[PDB]
Symmetry: D4
Subunit: 113 residues, 8 copies
């Protein structure tokens, strides 16, 4: 499936064409990047802040045009957040979860919010 | 009943006298214009975006002034959005639904928000 | 009791010392003013707009500083709004209630929001 | 050549059809009303704050839609603001100036901002 | 060098892929659409406002990312505003200028703001 | 344990590194500082005000990033508001509570909001 | 001529009755409070940052109502910033200048912004 | 004098301790990272947009607290933007220019904006 970039960086293939959402995704990629390089509390903290913030803003933009698939996308966001709140050290899974998230879940909203 | 403009474009007879609201209505007539020329998913998505944003935006405006008949107006919106989330291709009903909504349901909030 | 200013205009004895709230009280006085001269549907509407609009803005600021007496003040607001939405031309009562509302319920939030 | 209201209160003939502008004009009328009754520095100060505010807000409305006649309108606003800053007590002039400004100068922007 | 739609109405070929900018164009199109049918002062001012408002909104959009060609873009806006301010009644030129502005000048900012 | 500064003035050792949050922390120190010198209604009011504002402002900063320990932090806040709303003149506890709140409860959100 | 607090903390005698502005004044008093204790670079930057933020924030408030004495006030503001930018260690002169700034110059904008 | 990351990614050592600013630096690094790999027109624009946005946001933050060294910092920003407006493909210069820009010029505004 979806190739996990390496180095774990955001590439134009992730584009939603929503400049704001795009730039936040870039910062999130950077978050996990360091996470895999040192699973520590500070990196997790930085990523955890960045994630939840971005996850809320995207839900905000979705709710603003009453996005049809808001709930499923919100359930999704809750999942990765729960994961981050009960970390087991699985960086690979986060890497693949995050990529598959933008490409199959975020992508559903392109042209709709 | 209310005449359906052909071409399905917005005209001054639809004015609510709230500029921002009148402008969003012009864009909404446009979404249904194309949705009748080619019932595709991009045109439905473009309409579903504009509609839902407008519906919410117009509801935010009603709540700012604690609009008295906000509930029936919200019921009106949920139906057309519902229709759009269960689309059958009856662009005629969509065309006549919006015209009446503006002139009968949107018109009520005139001077009241 | 509280003197019902005649003409029914806002005056300095009604200062909450909140400039934006004060400017909105002036506008609302003018609503009751015309409503007393012509009890029609538009005058009632104009008032019902500024009133509901004013009450909300005031509830927002009260909440911003977690105003201790917020519930009581909201039951008040609603009472007037219910009254406006159930008009019976009682302009004198509307004049007095508003006079007492600023002077007793509004004056409580002074220096607290 | 417009009639000076008595009492100097705002009435519907003054509507520009822009609710927030109409609300600001209602307050502005109140400030000259008290200044007329008592020309004190406090009543002036109040009117001056309200006039400096409304003139700016309104000017911002005009610059938003790149109003065609902004400069003439601004020159006007600076004229009353100037009269207020070199107040000579001519409360009769002030009343007709403001009554005319909205009825000739403000009315000109109706449907353009 | 681009074909003038008939009826003069916005279409997806006109996409800049920026939702708000795209929605505003649909409103501006409606504006010239009516100015073509009836060249009166009402229709012209409606167009002028929506034109003045959109050109500014877009210019701020370009300024927020320090667009490289904001200057040449600005001047072009001023050309059509000047035309509107000094209207000779050339509804033909108006229709092509705008269709061509969006596709040759707006398009330049695609992915840059 | 934690040293209650004398005079009760916010010092750099209370830094959360969120400038806006620290400035509000400087003003909350001021309120307590006065309430200590004179337990009166007007000093209590002042404190109750900045306090509730800061508590909400900080809760809105926490919820932005979907903070993990938002609840315990809300409970904490509610406790101190209750104290203020059921004032027993215990200015010592307040001085100790607040110093301890920042350093053990606010300090938790550093890098996380 | 105004009395310099000791400790150099803000007190209700300072209130301009603009809650937001008053709160900023508190933080500002704290900045210079510590500069008096330790003239170090950090204490000066913290202060300097606070003076720049408030001074600009307050000038935005004055411009919002076109304050009559904005130019003079801005010149006062520049005098302090300049002394902070060309610091000679005169912490005594800084304490009076600021107490005297709010008590004589800021106080002039009371009921005017 | 600072080492260039490899891969060219933002790392904790580049912290300004301003979350959003650091969140913006993280994305900028990514913009030049790809441009190094493939110097195409598209990558240049993604970087050029982000560089424009960030530079403005930051200059606005510096303007907010009236940063003493704002002027000097604005010229530095103009250097990179100018270079990006007259791109000759010198990716190595850009890698080091940015790395040094934040570590020496940005770092100067720490605790001052």
């Amino acid at each position: 499936g979806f190739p996990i970039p390496d180095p774990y960086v955001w590439d134009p293939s992730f584009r939603t064409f929503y400049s704001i959402i795009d730039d936040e995704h870039k910062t999130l990629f950077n978050g996990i990047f360091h996470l895999a390089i040192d699973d520590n509390a500070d990196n997790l903290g930085e990523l955890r802040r960045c994630t939840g913030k971005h996850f809320l803003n995207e839900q905000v933009l979705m709710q603003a045009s009453q996005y049809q698939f808001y709930d499923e996308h919100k359930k999704e966001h809750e999942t990765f957040i729960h994961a981050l709140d009960n970390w087991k050290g699985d960086v690979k899974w986060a890497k693949s979860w995050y990529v598959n998230h933008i490409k199959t879940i975020d992508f559903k909203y392109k042209g709709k919010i």
